């Protein structure tokens, strides 16, 4: 992706979008009990911790585009993956508006908590002013969609989250693009049944883990992934995507039965218009992280990409023996023979993708079931039930998270969520985690699950 044009919003008649510039994150009561290094992301230019130009840093992810046709490798990649998805009988019929807004099996109700985007954010109109869970009212929504239409600008927010010392200093804060409520709803109508099928079928047929429950899904992954593991990281995957990868996505959508008209919304993602505070800008390429379907579309594109690179370097490859599971940029994969990921990475660079060794580190290559991570979690077979696999979030990350809060009123839910991740690290680690929590008075006011209870419920869930 490439920023093609940027100017002051007022020149085009856009008001300044007044997005948050002060973090909602504050030290929790556990801040001194546990060790950690992470701090809130930089949200504004004048932040004293900056050791770089903020506005330059946050847009530096847009590294450019490679301008190419959809080549022979891409075409075969699309064919192969399309053949997998054909198995699922995805419906290209529009999802009914009520289902697409207020919830159905495989597609949770539209989040009423997030930004309603443009122009609502300039009018002080929130999602809850238009929508109502209790009523399932579609009347105001239909009015709004008729009044303002589709293809509205996206509103760029800086993500308010914890970041490493390095990412704070370098000003490498992440951005979220909020699609207008109008476009979110329209895309959910158009692609909702596809969203639904993906959510209901995480695994190696969709090549997707979006919507998965790691407590359950992790025992299935080594069964699905037969051979030598392949994993690598991307640097700035979303923003690196060139228009050619969106063309591939449109081709795969058409093979599923979507019409040229229905795939027009992919152009909205690819060639996008954004508002950031007092500026507005156009991007050619780049997945706008935050719009409807961007996790699923990022995953589908990743399925095309990896196959393309394999076909290009290993002309003798048998993709029918290749398996992969993506969650956006994150990938875990296998092939029955060793594959040199460093070769794939160089082929990736030719397509404007920046691929690096798995989980930082120096080489590409020797990934094992012991060191592989996916969705930030390691894989550890249960010692007693060896066919069941623990997702293991590092205690370091759990410690980082408990030291901060966006609202102390949520302490019970926050700490409980962390317990559900922590116990997979083993009984001794859990017991210590609970002891430290309880060394603060608040900690003794919380309902914390016992290890044996967590383990029992987990075992029973299968």
Residues at the annotated binding site for Mg(2+)?
233, 329
Among 36, 207, 286, 443, binds Na ion (CB under 5 A): 286
Q: How many amino acids of this chain bind Na ion (CB under 5 A)?
A: 3
Q: Which residues contact 89 (CB under 8 A, 6 or more apart)?
A: none
Among 95, 229, 283, 367, binds Na ion (CB under 5 A): 283
Helix and strand element counts for the chain (H, E): 18, 17
Q: Which span (3-11, 221-229, 232-240, 276-284) binds Na ion, by CB under 5 A?
A: 276-284
What is the nearest approach in angstroms of Na ion to the Cβ of residue 288? 5
Closest chain position to Na ion (CB) = 272
Scanning 201-340, the segments in alpha helix (DSSP H) are 214-217, 221-224, 237-240, 243-255, 264-270, 294-313
What is the nearest approach in angstroms of Na ion to the Cβ of residue 45? 24
Burial class for 201, CB neighbours closer than 10 Å (0-12, 13-18, 19+): middle
Separation between Cα atoms, residue 115 and residue 122, nearest integer Å = 11
What is the nearest approach in angstroms of Na ion to the Cβ of residue 353? 15
Separation between Cα atoms, residue 223 and residue 199, nearest integer Å = 19
Residue 141 tokens, joined: 């929504």
What is the nearest approach in angstroms of Na ion to the Cβ of residue 262? 19
* Nearest to Na ion of 236, 286 (CB atom): 286
Binding site members: 233, 329
Please report the DSSP string for 412-458 in residue order: HHHHHHHHHHHGGG-HHHHHHHHHHHTTSGGGGGS----HHHHHHHH
* Nearest to Na ion of 189, 272 (CB atom): 272
Angle at 208 between CA 213 and CA 257, to 5 degrees: 130
What is the nearest approach in angstroms of Na ion to the Cβ of residue 194? 20
* Nearest to Na ion of 291, 344 (CB atom): 291
* Nearest to Na ion of 73, 246 (CB atom): 246
Cα-to-chain-centroid distance, residue 191: 18
* Nearest to Na ion of 208, 272 (CB atom): 272
* Nearest to Na ion of 95, 266 (CB atom): 266
Q: Which residues contact 337 (CB under 8 A, 6 or more apart)?
A: 227, 228
Q: Which span (15-23, 280-288, 392-400, 447-455) binds Na ion, by CB under 5 A?
A: 280-288
What is the nearest approach in angstroms of Na ion to the Cβ of residue 203? 28
Position 193 contacts Na ion (CB under 5 A): no
In order of 333, 341, 350, 366, 371, the CA distances from 358 in angstroms are 12, 10, 20, 9, 9
Q: Which residues contact 46 (CB under 8 A, 6 or more apart)?
A: none
Position 294 contacts Na ion (CB under 5 A): no
Q: Which span (55-63, 209-217, 269-277, 313-321) binds Na ion, by CB under 5 A?
A: 269-277
Q: Which span (4-12, 277-285, 354-362, 425-433) binds Na ion, by CB under 5 A?
A: 277-285
* Half-sphere CA count of 456, side-chain side, radius 13 A: 5
Position 272 contacts Na ion (CB under 5 A): yes
Q: Which span (140-148, 285-293, 333-341, 378-386) binds Na ion, by CB under 5 A?
A: 285-293
What is the nearest approach in angstroms of Na ion to the Cβ of residue 117? 15
What is the nearest approach in angstroms of Na ion to the Cβ of residue 41? 22
Separation between Cα atoms, residue 425 and residue 380, nearest integer Å = 9
* Nearest to Na ion of 67, 139 (CB atom): 67
Q: Which span (128-136, 155-163, 283-291, 308-316) binds Na ion, by CB under 5 A?
A: 283-291
* Nearest to Na ion of 65, 206 (CB atom): 65
Residue 338 tokens, joined: 């060793």
Residues at the site binding Na ion, with contacts judged by CB under 5 A? 272, 283, 286
């Amino acid at each position: 992706g490439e920023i093609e044009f940027i100017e002051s919003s007022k020149d085009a008649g856009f008001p300044v979008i007044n997005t948050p510039s002060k973090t909602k994150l504050e030290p929790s009561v556990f801040h001194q009990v546990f060790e950690g290094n992470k701090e809130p992301a930089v949200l504004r230019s004048g932040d004293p911790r900056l050791k770089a130009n903020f506005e330059e840093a946050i847009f530096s992810k847009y590294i450019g585009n490679v301008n190419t046709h959809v080549d022979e490798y891409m075409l075969e990649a699309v064919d192969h993956y399309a053949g997998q998805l054909a198995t699922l009988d995805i419906s290209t019929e529009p999802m009914k508006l009520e289902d697409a807004v207020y919830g159905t099996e495989g597609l949770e109700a539209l989040d009423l908590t997030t930004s309603a985007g443009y122009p609502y954010v300039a009018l002080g109109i929130k999602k809850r002013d238009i929508l109502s869970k209790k009523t399932k009212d579609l009347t105001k929504l239909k009015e709004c969609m008729d009044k303002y239409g589709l293809n509205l600008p996206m509103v760029t927010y800086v993500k308010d989250e914890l970041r490493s010392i390095e990412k704070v200093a370098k000003g490498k804060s992440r951005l979220i693009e909020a699609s207008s409520l109008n476009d979110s709803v329209a895309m959910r109508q158009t692609f909702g049944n596809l969203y639904k099928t993906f959510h209901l079928n995480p695994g190696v047929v969709t090549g997707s883990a979006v919507g998965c429950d790691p407590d359950l899904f992790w025992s299935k992954i080594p069964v699905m992934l037969d051979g030598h593991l392949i994993a690598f990281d991307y640097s700035g995957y979303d923003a690196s995507l060139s228009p050619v990868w969106f063309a591939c996505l449109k081709m795969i959508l058409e093979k599923l039965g979507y019409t040229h008209k229905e795939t027009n919304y992919i152009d909205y993602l690819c060639n996008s218009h954004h508002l950031y505070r007092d500026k507005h800008y156009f991007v050619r390429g780049g997945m706008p992280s935050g719009c409807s379907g961007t996790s699923i579309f990022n995953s589908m594109i990743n399925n095309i990409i990896i196959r393309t690179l394999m076909l290009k370097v290993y002309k003798g490859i048998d993709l029918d023996q290749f398996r992969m599971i993506a969650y956006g940029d994150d990938v875990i994969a296998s092939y029955p023979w060793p594959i040199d990921a460093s070769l794939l990475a160089e082929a990736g660079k030719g397509y404007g993708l920046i691929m690096t060794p798995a989980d930082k580190g120096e080489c590409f290559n020797e990934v094992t079931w012991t060191n592989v991570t996916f969705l930030k979690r390691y894989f550890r077979a249960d010692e007693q039930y060896p066919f069941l696999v623990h997702p293991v979030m590092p205690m370091k990350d759990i410690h980082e998270s408990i030291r901060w809060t966006k609202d102390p009123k949520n302490t019970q839910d926050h700490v409980r969520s962390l317990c559900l991740l922590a116990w997979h690290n083993g009984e001794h680690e859990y017991e210590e985690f609970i002891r430290k929590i309880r060394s603060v008075p608040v900690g003794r006011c919380l309902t914390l699950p016992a290890f044996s209870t967590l383990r029992r419920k987990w075992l029973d869930s299968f």
